């Protein structure tokens, strides 16, 4: 075919690209073992889109498999794991057939597949056989195992494998100001190249070196942030001016060793550098689990059993004596670590399965595509910090024993009492999209909120759209248009009916406007809160509230293959708002208005033209017709008065009466924007124009433009007119001639051919702002004296367009793309397609299920720590990941800043003064003096000053006897809305020695 459905795959497409997905769509995948681990891998791969998925697992469902296998139900017990799962995986993605392989007795059947994945159900002996057949046949091979809080993955893509793009990052690009004969390239002005030694670049527009532009790649030697070297260029000529360099990613051939070879000589990728010495230990420990099993007829060590733990330690010890190189000469077996592996061998933990489900599924996608850098080749992982303090929740053969319960292999690790506390937790989940669904899935498997004192509340104000389906696995095509939270709550209760009646799905947005719903009682009843959000503002909002209510918050995020987790613990750590993230790059206005050199610039300009033409104009007209104080109110209050008044004037003076009128209007806008406006700019600054200095004005980031001659056969000229006319029609309630069809070229052409396009005449008194650091942005009386009186226009209304990037039939992206590409033609900038314009103008965030799933897994390993109320900051881990590298890193959270006043330590984030009742001002000042040694110097409510110590006696007599609320009313003249139950006051104060001191804030409780 060569076809990819953008409407479904939109967000994944910006992560992987067209070519990688085309390869994925020719790849048949086979997964061996369908417990938690395999079904997690299978879900993520079926979602991503491969040619076919085949599952093999003839084992009967037992109750304990439901620990992490979210597609098994208790009714399925007895039936084959693979058979029952097949239809549910099929539902995730209609484009991907899902088949069951009945038997794997004939190894030869493996040849139907391009990638084979062996999970925890495959013996090591069989892994080695399968790997040997795969490796020697050209089949990519991956395996993975989880055992309680421990896990590993192994990757082997064969002798010959080619990585096509190591990172998935945008290629670096930049403007050149000089190239010396020895090949030293100097950037224009303050621009950094961003390259690294060994990068490759091509060039264009380099005048004087002509064949340097032919696509030849040059190897980069970096000299500083602003220069690099490419080797001698004397042979190509001599640099004159101009030049843009573009980074090019070159192919890289790598080899992998077999599982057999790597068992005795592993290449490790570390999952946590703080723990790198454990990789060798666990490498041995996992081999001993398999030896142990061969000695015990297939069985793993028993839960929390000392006798088996000792045998495991003996097996690992015999390995290190036989191979002294594996731990190192004179390095001891870490017995406590191996003992835990044995104790937990039977554990099946949602968090760990999610982490490895995401990772391995991404590795499968790499294997199919040559996109991103493969894991090479063993990775080990543990989350032992998640274990509770054994004082509170002892672990032994009794507490840890099974109970005939879907939670038995979680109990195996944590014990019964702890599992019960998870069940009785009360949580607020903010957001029900990608992370939201993963999180709700994890909580279902945890049984979290299923207990009598527990519950879950989840909220999200958005509805389900088609592109969501690629990574929000709880939703089906039939569910499109419904509410994310409601649907998600239903789906999860089907996975685990222990939650039926325990999940409160709300559709309210979280923010300052919904505090009557999410009130004091609501927040104060919670144990903790979890974010599942896609914008910084909502995160900041929730963080502020978790600080105010003193609740833990679990935070996380993704961008393509990148992700992070952060824990915020009351009275212990910084909060989310305590740190700065790098801000959005801002484009200077002169670059947008007059001097674009990137497609990003023409897209922004186009997006504003779109707003002005089809949204703002209409809104201004409607205000003019329905607000009798509108001209008046505008003369005083607007930045661009002449702008608004011209807009209303033009909108009412050139009213179309039919569709043909809209075509003419769009054709004339083309002339103005891409021809007359450009000739005007050239009139002010001719091509040969010079600077006061004597250099050419049109250089560097300034590209001399050329005016456009309309040509219906140019795709961008055509679509500018089609989309412009159709949107204008919408504004004026005119029926399109295309409303039930494609646009006919000859018909637009007919209309345009009979038009009289007016010639251009320059304005000699017009002036143009070149830099952002200079000036300029009677008529207006005249302009008002040209407005139709609203009486002329009774019942007239313009219909403003609401920008919707995800409806390919509404002409929006069509317009912004054609409009941007026309300006790009003006300025010799390469044009962009609809997918790229939609990404930039729509501010779309690349997203994929693998990363979502992995990061959610990490969040849920941290969640264990909240349940245990840990106060040792060293136990917590903020996480950072990029699956493309692959990279994983962790750090202990930052402690909250501490302060002191008089002899008193306080927490600058979490501490406050809690005052009960609508206290009188004098009582408040007196209290602080007597109880805290603090001489209140300033007291404020929001922006208003309620008291200061410089107030003279008369003003003090006015305020001192007033309750806080009345004091606020005296100053602001507004009332307290009566639905308000608290007021925050900021104070400045002096300590006992009379020096100013930072102090906590105040909360007044009405």
């Amino acid at each position: 075919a060569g076809e990819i459905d953008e409407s479904l795959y939109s967000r994944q497409l910006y992560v992987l690209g067209k070519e990688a997905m085309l390869k994925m769509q020719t790849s048949n995948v086979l997964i061996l073992g369908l417990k938690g681990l395999g079904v997690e891998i299978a879900k993520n791969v079926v979602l991503a889109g491969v040619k076919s998925m085949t599952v093999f697992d003839p084992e009967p469902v037992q109750l304990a498999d439901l620990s992490t296998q979210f597609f098994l139900t208790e009714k399925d017990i007895g039936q084959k794991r693979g058979d029952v799962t097949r239809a549910k995986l099929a539902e995730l993605n209609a484009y991907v057939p899902v088949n069951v392989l009945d038997s794997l007795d004939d190894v030869t059947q493996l040849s139907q597949f391009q990638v084979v994945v062996a999970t925890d159900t495959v013996s090591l002996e069989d892994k080695v056989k399968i790997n040997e057949f795969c490796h020697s046949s050209g089949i990519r091979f991956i395996s993975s195992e989880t055992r309680g809080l421990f896990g590993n993955t192994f990757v082997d893509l064969g002798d010959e494998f080619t990585v096509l793009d190591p990172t998935g990052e945008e290629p670096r690009t930049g403007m050149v100001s000089d190239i010396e004969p020895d090949g030293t390239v100097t950037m224009l002005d303050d621009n950094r190249h961003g390259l690294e030694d060994g990068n490759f670049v091509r060039f264009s527009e380099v005048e004087g070196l002509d064949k340097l532009n032919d696509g030849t790649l040059f190897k980069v030697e970096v000299l500083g942030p602003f220069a690099f070297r490419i080797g001698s260029v004397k042979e190509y000529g001599e640099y004159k001016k101009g030049g843009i360099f573009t980074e090019v990613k070159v192919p890289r051939k790598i080899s992998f060793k077999s599982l057999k070879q790597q068992l005795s000589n592993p290449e490790f990728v570390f999952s946590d550098f703080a723990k790198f010495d454990r990789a060798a230990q666990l490498h041995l420990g996992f081999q001993a689990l398999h030896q142990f099993a061969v000695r015990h007829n297939g069985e793993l060590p028993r839960t929390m059993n000392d006798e088996d733990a000792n045998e495991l330690i003996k097996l690992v010890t015999d390995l290190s004596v036989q191979q002294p190189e594996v731990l190192g000469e004179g390095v001891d077996v870490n017995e406590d670590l191996i003992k835990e592996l044995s104790y937990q061998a039977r554990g099946d933990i949602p968090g760990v399965v999610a982490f490895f489900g995401g990772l391995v599924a991404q590795e499968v996608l790499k294997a199919c595509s040559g996109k991103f850098t493969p894991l090479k080749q063993f990775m080990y992982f543990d989350s032992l910090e998640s274990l509770p303090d054994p004082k509170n929740f002892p672990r032994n053969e009794k507490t840890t024993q099974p109970v005939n319960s879907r939670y038995d292999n979680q109990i195996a690790v944590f014990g019964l009492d702890f599992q019960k506390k998870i069940a009785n937790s009360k949580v607020f989940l903010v957001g029900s999209g990608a992370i939201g669904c993963e999180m709700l899935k994890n909580w279902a498997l945890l049984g979290l909120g299923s207990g009598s004192d527990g519950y879950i509340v989840v909220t999200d104000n958005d509805s389900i759209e088609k592109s969501n389906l690629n990574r929000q696995f709880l939703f089906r095509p039939k569910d499109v248009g419904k509410n994310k939270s409601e649907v998600a709550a239903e789906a999860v209760c089907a996975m685990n009916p222990d939650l039926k009646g325990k999940i409160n799905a709300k559709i309210d947005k979280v923010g300052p406007e919904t505090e009557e719903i999410f009130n004091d009682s609501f927040w104060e009843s919670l144990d903790f809160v979890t974010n599942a959000l896609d914008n910084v503002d909502a995160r900041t909002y929730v963080d502020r509230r978790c600080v105010f209510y003193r609740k833990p918050l679990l935070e996380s995020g993704t961008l393509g293959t990148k992700g992070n987790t952060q824990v915020i613990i009351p009275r212990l750590t910084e909060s989310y708002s305590s740190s700065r993230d790098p801000p959005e790059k801002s484009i200077p206005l002169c670059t947008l208005r007059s001097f674009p050199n990137k497609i990003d610039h023409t897209i922004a300009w186009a997006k504003s033209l779109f707003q002005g033409y089809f949204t703002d104009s209409a809104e201004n007209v409607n205000m003019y017709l329905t607000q009798p104080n509108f001209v008046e109110q505008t003369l005083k209050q607007s930045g661009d008065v002449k702008g608004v008044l011209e807009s209303i004037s033009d909108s009412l003076s050139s009213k179309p009466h039919n569709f043909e009128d809209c075509i003419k209007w769009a054709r004339l806008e083309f002339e103005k924007k891409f021809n007359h406006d450009i000739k005007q700019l050239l009139f002010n600054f001719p091509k040969d124009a010079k600077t006061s200095n004597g250099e050419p004005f049109w250089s560097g980031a300034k590209r001399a433009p050329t005016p456009l001659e309309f040509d219906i056969y140019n795709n961008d000229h055509f679509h500018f007119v089609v989309a412009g006319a159709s949107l204008r029609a919408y504004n004026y309630g005119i029926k399109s001639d295309d409303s039930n069809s494609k646009p006919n070229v000859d018909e637009y052409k007919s209309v345009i051919d009979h038009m009289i396009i007016p010639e251009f005449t320059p304005n000699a008194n017009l002036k143009i702002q070149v830099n952002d650091d200079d000036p300029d942005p009677d008529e207006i009386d005249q302009l008002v004296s040209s407005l139709p009186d609203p009486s002329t226009l009774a019942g007239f209304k313009l219909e403003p367009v609401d920008f919707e990037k995800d409806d390919d039939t509404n002409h929006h992206i069509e317009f912004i793309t054609a409009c941007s590409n026309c300006r790009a033609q003006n300025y010799f900038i390469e044009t962009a397609d609809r997918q790229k314009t939609k990404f930039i103008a729509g501010r779309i965030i690349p997203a994929i299920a693998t990363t979502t799933s992995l990061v959610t897994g990490l969040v849920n390993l941290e969640l264990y720590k909240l349940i245990d109320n840990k106060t040792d900051i060293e136990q917590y881990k903020n996480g950072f990941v990029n699956l493309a590298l692959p990279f994983f890193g962790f750090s202990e959270p930052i402690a909250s800043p501490k302060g002191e006043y008089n002899n008193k330590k306080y927490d600058k984030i979490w501490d406050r003064f809690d005052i009960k009742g609508d206290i009188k001002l004098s009582d408040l000042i007196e209290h602080f003096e007597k109880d805290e040694g603090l001489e209140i110097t300033m007291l404020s409510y929001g922006v208003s000053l309620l008291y200061a110590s410089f107030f003279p006696p008369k003003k003090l007599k006015e305020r001192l006897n007033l309750p806080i609320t009345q004091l606020v009313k005296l100053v602001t003249k507004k009332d307290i809305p009566a639905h308000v139950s608290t007021m925050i006051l900021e104070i400045c104060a002096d300590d006992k020695e009379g020096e100013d001191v930072e102090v906590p804030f105040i909360t007044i409780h009405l």
Partner: protein, 78 residues
């Protein structure tokens, strides 16, 4: 005594620095600003399980020559 250490970013880029074991984290962040353009307040550096804080030295985090630090970011999608 002067040594080389490495800073890897979340995008895969590797930066090389020359430092002495007695340099402050502040010092190191400033060296990163001269090379990458990022301002010290926006930099997040982790090494061996710890996030590096502005008032301390490399020695406080047992950073040795050839050590690799990681510059990481908080992501905003989900």
């Amino acid at each position: 005594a002067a040594m080389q250490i490495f800073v890897k970013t979340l995008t895969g880029k590797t930066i090389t620095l020359e430092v002495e074991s007695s340099d402050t984290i502040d010092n190191v962040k400033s060296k990163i600003q001269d090379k990458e353009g990022i301002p010290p307040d926006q930099q997040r550096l982790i090494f061996a399980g710890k996030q590096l804080e502005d008032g301390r030295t490399l020695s406080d985090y047992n950073i040795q020559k050839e050590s690799t630090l990681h510059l990481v970011l908080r992501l905003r999608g989900g």
